[model samples]
Target: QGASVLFGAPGAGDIEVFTTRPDTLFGATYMVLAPEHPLVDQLAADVWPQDTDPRWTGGQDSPRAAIEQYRRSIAAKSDLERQENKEKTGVFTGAYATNPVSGKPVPVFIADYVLLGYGTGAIMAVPGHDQRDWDFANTFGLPVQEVISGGDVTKAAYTGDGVLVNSDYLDGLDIEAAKVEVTRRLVKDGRGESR
Candidate 1:
């Protein structure tokens, strides 16, 4: 598995997001966290002082209320129940996380697709490579940037190996090379751990 750090503006702290394709970092348009993730509280608390984050153009008016309601809505569902309902459901947390690689703030969202028991309780949304993420992005009108050179994102995600594109230092490298280089850089920068 590949590990990457997901952090929010300034003091909101950071969380680890496990991915198999760290090469897709630049394509990460948003991030998802399990509703039960501890970081949700921290994110909510951090949002209270600000009227709204510029990234949060849609969703509920209050970040705290949105998180609270989303949690309650899924509170009764067991892990199996949540997983079985493949129809993606989520709410924007009104918080934006800084993508360590892109140095851009990616919107944070609470979604059932991520489970607290999962590797890191969070995930970077690379809609260009992951089908589930593509579907969610389509539903929410999130921006989709292609980092790998294959497949037309307009139709669906392309999971096959391809040369990297739009991925900063990893650009023009093959999947394996990009993965190795990105992991190496992540380690060098103290932004992630190899696992």
Candidate 2:
């Protein structure tokens, strides 16, 4: 059994993301899908939500307009080039994904940094422990949540093993234990499964 995180959104249904660190689910403040991901057209809202972060708007009038403009420019790019550009960039979809672990809504975004044929259909962004996700969050003014303890994510991600925090039932457990424990619970509750 592997790690599976089900992040759901209205109109887009359920999206299952595979992660090596299920323990970091609580740190998933946002999610990123490849620019080509089909959900882009479906979830791009007509307008940004209330108090929406302006940095997320891409200087466009609406999410749909933003996506179209981004696609027009980004479609010509390659995955390798995208990976090489450490200055991560993304556009908000004006939609949200419900974090199963946090029971809070997480912003949805599209970016070239996520390869079309890469790790999974989507990325559940754990900015606290993921470097690229961290940079991407800063680039878009999105939130960075640290589910693990012992690291100052305000500066950079802490990839080392540490105790869990900011996570309800999963708190107090070490990284590996938290990973296994959360998976067991999600599996038992039918919210997720082993990949």
lDDT of 2 by residue, 23-74 (tens): 8888888888888887778888888999588887789999988888888887
lDDT of each: 0.77, 0.82
Candidate No. with top TM-score:
2
Output the lDDT of residue 155, model 1: 86
List ranges where model 1 is wrong by over 4 Å: 4-9, 45-59
Give the root-mean-square deviation of each candidate in angstroms. 3.1, 1.6
Q: Please, what is the TM-score per model?
A: 0.87, 0.92
Query: Where's the lowest-lDDT run of ten residues in candidate 1?
Result: 49-58
Q: Which run of 10 residues does model 2 get worst, by summed lDDT?
A: 112-121
For model 1, residues 32-123, the per-residue Cα lDDT tens digits are: 88989887777764343354433342355577877888888889888887766667788777677888766888878888767877478888
